[PDB]
Design a protein around this nucleic acid. Structure first.
Ligand SMILES: [K+]
Ligand SMILES: [K+]
Ligand SMILES: [K+]
Ligand SMILES: [K+]
Ligand SMILES: [K+]
Ligand SMILES: [K+]
Ligand SMILES: [K+]
Ligand SMILES: [K+]
Ligand SMILES: [K+]
Ligand SMILES: [K+]
Ligand SMILES: [K+]
Ligand SMILES: [K+]
Ligand SMILES: [K+]
Ligand SMILES: [K+]
Ligand SMILES: [K+]
Ligand SMILES: [K+]
Ligand SMILES: [K+]
Ligand SMILES: [K+]
Ligand SMILES: [K+]
Ligand SMILES: [K+]
Ligand SMILES: [K+]
Ligand SMILES: [K+]
Ligand SMILES: [K+]
Ligand SMILES: [K+]
Ligand SMILES: [K+]
Ligand SMILES: [K+]
Ligand SMILES: [K+]
Ligand SMILES: [Mg+2]
Ligand SMILES: [Mg+2]
Ligand SMILES: [Mg+2]
Ligand SMILES: [Mg+2]
Ligand SMILES: [Mg+2]
Ligand SMILES: [Mg+2]
Ligand SMILES: [Mg+2]
Ligand SMILES: [Mg+2]
Ligand SMILES: [Mg+2]
Ligand SMILES: [Mg+2]
Ligand SMILES: [Mg+2]
Ligand SMILES: [Mg+2]
Ligand SMILES: [Mg+2]
Ligand SMILES: [Mg+2]
Ligand SMILES: [Mg+2]
Ligand SMILES: [Mg+2]
Ligand SMILES: [Mg+2]
Ligand SMILES: [Mg+2]
Ligand SMILES: [Mg+2]
Ligand SMILES: [Mg+2]
Ligand SMILES: [Mg+2]
Ligand SMILES: [Mg+2]
Ligand SMILES: [Mg+2]
Ligand SMILES: [Mg+2]
Ligand SMILES: [Mg+2]
Ligand SMILES: [Mg+2]
Ligand SMILES: [Mg+2]
Ligand SMILES: [Mg+2]
Ligand SMILES: [Mg+2]
Ligand SMILES: [Mg+2]
Ligand SMILES: [Mg+2]
Ligand SMILES: [Mg+2]
Ligand SMILES: [Mg+2]
Ligand SMILES: [Mg+2]
Ligand SMILES: [Mg+2]
Ligand SMILES: [Mg+2]
Lengths: 50, 146, 64
RNA sequence: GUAGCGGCGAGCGAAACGGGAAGAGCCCAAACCAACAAGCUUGUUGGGGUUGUAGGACUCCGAUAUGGUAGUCUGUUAGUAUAGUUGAAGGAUUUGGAAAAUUCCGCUAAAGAGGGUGAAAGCCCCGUAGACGAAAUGCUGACAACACCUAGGAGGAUCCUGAGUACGGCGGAACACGAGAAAUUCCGUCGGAAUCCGCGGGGACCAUCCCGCAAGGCUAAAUACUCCCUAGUGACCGAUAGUGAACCAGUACCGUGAGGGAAAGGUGAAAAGCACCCCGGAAGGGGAGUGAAAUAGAUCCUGAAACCGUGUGCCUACAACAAGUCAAAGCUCGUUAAUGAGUGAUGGCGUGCCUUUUGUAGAAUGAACCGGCGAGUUACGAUUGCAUGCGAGGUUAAGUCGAAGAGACGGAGCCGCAGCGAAAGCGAGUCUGAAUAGGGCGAAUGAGUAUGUAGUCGUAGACCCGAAACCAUGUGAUCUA
RNA sequence: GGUAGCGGAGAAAUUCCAAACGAACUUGGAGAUAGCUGGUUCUCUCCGAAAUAGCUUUAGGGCUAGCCUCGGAAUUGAGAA
RNA sequence: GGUGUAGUGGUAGGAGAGCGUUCUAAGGGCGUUGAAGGUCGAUCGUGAGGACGGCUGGAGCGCUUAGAAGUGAGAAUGCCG
RNA sequence: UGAAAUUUUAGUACCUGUGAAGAUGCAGGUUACCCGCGACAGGACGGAAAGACCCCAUGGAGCUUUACUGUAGUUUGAUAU
C-alpha cells in the first residue's frame, strides 16, 4: 500500500523480488512474478481499484 | 500464463508473406506481378475507376439532387425499445441518453411504430409518427411534443 | 492521410439500404426526339450500379 | 474527407458547435482644462479618457480609499548550475599463465545500475543506494524596497468617439471558394460617406430582427525548432554497417572555379616488441630467448573463397569430350561401420545457367572468377478474412496523473440500431403516380462494434536501378571568339 | 583587362565560350517522369491459367467480362456423358 | 491410429504448411576441462536444412516458448574489394 | 622489366543434314597419337559502341509559321499628375 516506503526500500534490492504499489500494478508484473506477496491493505486497495 | 509458455489463440496471428525470396516460395522473381506491363512497374497501376480511356461510369451518369441547408434528421426510436421501460415511466430525451438508447439525438427524437408497445408511458419527443402516437395512446400512455 | 472521396461519384450516386448504389440513367439530357417515348419513360426510372462497375469504384465511395 | 470548390476533370478541401492545453488584459487619438510660445486660433507640455447592457467630456453630488502589476542588474533570503567529500560486505579449494570460473563454507544490501581488473566478481578497483559539500560567478523563486496602475452615483443641452478613411468602379490577389449568385479580407488606380435619429456584419441584394462599434497601439501562457551544453535511453549500427569522416576527414586526391570527395579499426594480460649466435651488403631467414600461445613478430586476433605452389594414391600420348550421369574391370585406402571411400580403362545416354520469347544449346540477352553489399518497407486511411472482448450495442480521441510503461479518468466524438425521396417531408415504410394499382428501394428475413493479425488497395518516391531532359541559385573569357 | 548562358562572341561553320555547346559547368527542386528494358534472394504441399470478347488518341498500355485460385451460402440437384 | 478407394507434371498465378538468419522477453542451460567462427569427415531428415567427431580458434553461445524484422542472392553491361 | 581489350565452364575437327530456318558442342558418317614454336586471318553471326538507318513512346530538345493560347516591346484612347 502507498506509504510503506521502508518496506519498499528494504525489499527492492533483493534479486528475486520486484516491489510495486497496490495502486500501480500491471499484468506483466503479476505474470512475471512466480509468487505475489501482498499486504492486507494492498489487497483491499487492489479490490477497490478493480 | 507463464512468460516462457506464451501461446496465442489459434488463428489470431498469421505469418507475413515475403515476395521476391526465391522461386519455390511461389512469389520469386516477378513477385506475383506477372510479366511486364504497367501493373508490373514500381508505382504502377492506373488511378481508381480509370477505364483505359473509355468514358468512366461517373462521367456517363448525370449529377442529381441537392443538399438542403436546413436539413433536419431526427434520432429514431421504436416501440420495441420503449418496452425496456416500466409502466408509468416518463420517457424523455435525457432519459434516453442516460439509458444509452440515444447517444446522439441529432435534430431531436422522433418515435416510430416498428415494434409493439406494451407499457403505459408518458413519452416526450420532438416528433411522433401517426402510428406511433396511436400505439402510445392505445397502451394507456400519452405523448407530448417537446 | 485520410482516403479521399471521388466527388463526381458522390454527386451522381446514392447508397441504398442494402449497401448498393442507386444511380441515374444516361441519355436523359437532350435529343429526346431521337428516342421513343417508351425509351424516355423507362430511362426516367433510376437503376443500380452493376456488379462489375461497383467492384471497380467501391473504394472511392467507402466513406461517402 | 463532411459543406463546398473543380476543363464539375485530375484533384483541392473548410470553418462554427462540442471536448481539451493555457489563460490576462491594457494603453493612446478626440472632445475638455491648465501652462508655454507665436500669429481670438495655433503648435508644444501637462492633466482628463479609452466605450456598444453605448462610453467620455460637460454639470451635480462623495470618495480622497480599495486592489493590482505583464515594472527595477534595488537590496535580503532560499534554492539551484558550474569542482568535489563520504559511501557495506570473502577467504580458501580445483583447473588454469592469470580466477571474477568450480567447490566449500561465510558476509553486505536505502548499494544485486553500470564499468574495469591477466576468463564470467553483490563483497578487488571506479562506482551505485544514501549522506554531505561552494570561496567565486551565474540563474530561479520568495521577502522587502522603490516604481507604476486602481475609483462610486445621477443628468443629458451641447461637445467627442480614429477621412481621402469606410465604401464604389476598374485590374489583380487571399479566403477550401478557379467570377461564379458572391459575401468577407488585401493590393494598384480613379471616384468617394455618414457620423449615435449614426455606422458595420449575419455569404449577391432589400426590409425586419439580432450581434457588434472599423479605419491607432501593446500584451505573458499554452505552440514551433536544436547549432550547442549536461545526464541518460534504445527488440538502433558494429568497420562495404553507423555521420562522408571510430584512424590527424571535409583530409589525401580531382577541378581554373563553384564544386566533387576517398581509402584506412583489432599483437599480447603485460612489450615481456625476439639479448646473443649463424647465412647475407642489406632485406629476410635459422637457432637461442620472451610469452600460456610467435603458424600471436608488429602485412601482427580469427584467417574463408577466388588465385598460386609443393608432395603424391589413381588415370592419361588412336583420341572428336555442355565434361556429367548410369554400368563397370583394375589399382589404392580403411570411415559418423555404412549392402565403405578415392581413382577409373571401357560401354550407354546426354547441346550449360539466366532473361525474354510462339519457339532459345542457341549464331538473341547477362555474368571473367571469388567474397561482401544489393530490390514489396513504414506512416496514415479503405476494405475482406482470421482471432479476442463485449453485444443492440461497441468504443474512446485530444488531454491530466504515471517509469519515455502499463493503468486510471476523460462519452466530446465515431460506427451500429430505419429507410425512403432531389427536397419539403413521411416513416416499416417511403418515392413515382390521379391510384387503396403496379413498380423501385427498404422491413418481415438483426449484429454490430473496439482491437490484434494477415491479404489487397489509396495517399506518400511506394519493389530496386536507369534517361534524353525541364526549372532556380550560383562558378567560369588562365582554352577559345 | 571587358563581354556569361532566357547570355556572350561569331569575315557566319550551329562556330567558340576550360580536351563532348541546336543552348557551358556546378549545386539544388530531386529519389524529376519513364504505359519502356533490366533485376527482384529459402523450401515443400494443393490447385492451376491466358495469349479471347467489348471499349479505349487504343493497338507491346489499360478497364469490365471470359479462363485460375481461396473462403462462404443455399438448393425440388440445378453440371457432365 | 488402422483399412479401402482415388489422387499426387507444371509457367503466369492463388492457397497452405515449414526451414534458416539477427535481435527481445521468460525459462532452462552450455563455456580456458575451450564459445562463436574456420576446416575435414564415409552422419540424419521428404525439403529448405540438423547433429555428432577430429583439427584450428581463443570468449562468448545454444536450447524451448512467444515476439520484432535492415531475415535468405547467381545473374541487374549491378557497387566495392 | 612487364600491361590491355576479352573471358558461362570448356578435354574447343571436317562433311552432309537437323534445329529460332547460317552448328566446335545436336544426328550420321569421316578424319584425327600427346605438347608446343614461327606465320595467315575463313569462323567463333569475333572485340569495341543497350544501332545513328527503320518503326514505336499519347519521350526530349533546337527551329519555322497565315497552328492554339499567351506575352516583352511598339502604338492608340480614357483617366490621375
Ligand atoms: K498477384
Ligand atoms: K445519377
Ligand atoms: K442525352
Ligand atoms: K476529413
Ligand atoms: K480531365
Ligand atoms: K487616467
Ligand atoms: K582485480
Ligand atoms: K563487476
Ligand atoms: K550563488
Ligand atoms: K469574392
Ligand atoms: K457581431
Ligand atoms: K594467434
Ligand atoms: K594435385
Ligand atoms: K561416360
Ligand atoms: K545481338
Ligand atoms: K403505391
Ligand atoms: K411498394
Ligand atoms: K466480433
Ligand atoms: K481487421
Ligand atoms: K519507395
Ligand atoms: K505498395
Ligand atoms: K582569354
Ligand atoms: K570563328
Ligand atoms: K554480378
Ligand atoms: K536463336
Ligand atoms: K580469322
Ligand atoms: K539537341
Ligand atoms: Mg508483424
Ligand atoms: Mg508460381
Ligand atoms: Mg532467379
Ligand atoms: Mg522481367
Ligand atoms: Mg507482354
Ligand atoms: Mg501484366
Ligand atoms: Mg433508337
Ligand atoms: Mg565502496
Ligand atoms: Mg564466489
Ligand atoms: Mg483562390
Ligand atoms: Mg479600389
Ligand atoms: Mg462590407
Ligand atoms: Mg442572410
Ligand atoms: Mg448588443
Ligand atoms: Mg507567446
Ligand atoms: Mg571485420
Ligand atoms: Mg565508413
Ligand atoms: Mg594458428
Ligand atoms: Mg592473423
Ligand atoms: Mg585408328
Ligand atoms: Mg591409348
Ligand atoms: Mg522472335
Ligand atoms: Mg558478356
Ligand atoms: Mg580575365
Ligand atoms: Mg546548317
Ligand atoms: Mg571545347
Ligand atoms: Mg518534386
Ligand atoms: Mg477518346
Ligand atoms: Mg552470433
Ligand atoms: Mg536483405
Ligand atoms: Mg558477385
Ligand atoms: Mg531446316
Ligand atoms: Mg547447318
Ligand atoms: Mg557432346
Ligand atoms: Mg560483334
Ligand atoms: Mg537498342
Amino acid at each position: 500500500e502507498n506509504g510503506n516506503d521502508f518496506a519498499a526500500l528494504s525489499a527492492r534490492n533483493l534479486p528475486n523480488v520486484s516491489v510495486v504499489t497496490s495502486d500501480n500494478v500491471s499484468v506483466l508484473d503479476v505474470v512475471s512474478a512466480n509468487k505475489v506477496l501482498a499486504t492486507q491493505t494492498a489487497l483491499t486497495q487492489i479490490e477497490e481499484v478493480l | 500464463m507463464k512468460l516462457h509458455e506464451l501461446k496465442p489463440a489459434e488463428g489470431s496471428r498469421q505469418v507475413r508473406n515475403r515476395v521476391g525470396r526465391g522461386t519455390s516460395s511461389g512469389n520469386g522473381k516477378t513477385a506475383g506481378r506477372g510479366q511486364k506491363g504497367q501493373k508490373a512497374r514500381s508505382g504502377g497501376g492506373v488511378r481508381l475507376g480509370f477505364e483505359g480511356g473509355q468514358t468512366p461510369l461517373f462521367r456517363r451518369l448525370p449529377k442529381r439532387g441537392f443538399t438542403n441547408i436546413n436539413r433536419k434528421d431526427y434520432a429514431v426510436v421504436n416501440l420495441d425499445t420503449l418496452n425496456r421501460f416500466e409502466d408509468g415511466t416518463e420517457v424523455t430525451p435525457v432519459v434516453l441518453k442516460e439509458a444509452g438508447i440515444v447517444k446522439n439525438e441529432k435534430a431531436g427524437i422522433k418515435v416510430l411504430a416498428d415494434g409493439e408497445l406494451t407499457k403505459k408511458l408518458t413519452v416526450k419527443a420532438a416528433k411522433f409518427s401517426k402510428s406511433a402516437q396511436e400505439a402510445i395512446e392505445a397502451a394507456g400512455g400519452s405523448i407530448e411534443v417537446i | 492521410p485520410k482516403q479521399k472521396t471521388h466527388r463526381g461519384l458522390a454527386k451522381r450516386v446514392k447508397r441504398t439500404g442494402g449497401g448498393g448504389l442507386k444511380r441515374g440513367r444516361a441519355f436523359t439530357s437532350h435529343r429526346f426526339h431521337g428516342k421513343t417515348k417508351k425509351q424516355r419513360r423507362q430511362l426516367r426510372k433510376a437503376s443500380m450500379v452493376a456488379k462489375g462497375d461497383y467492384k471497380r469504384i467501391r473504394q472511392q465511395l467507402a466513406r461517402m
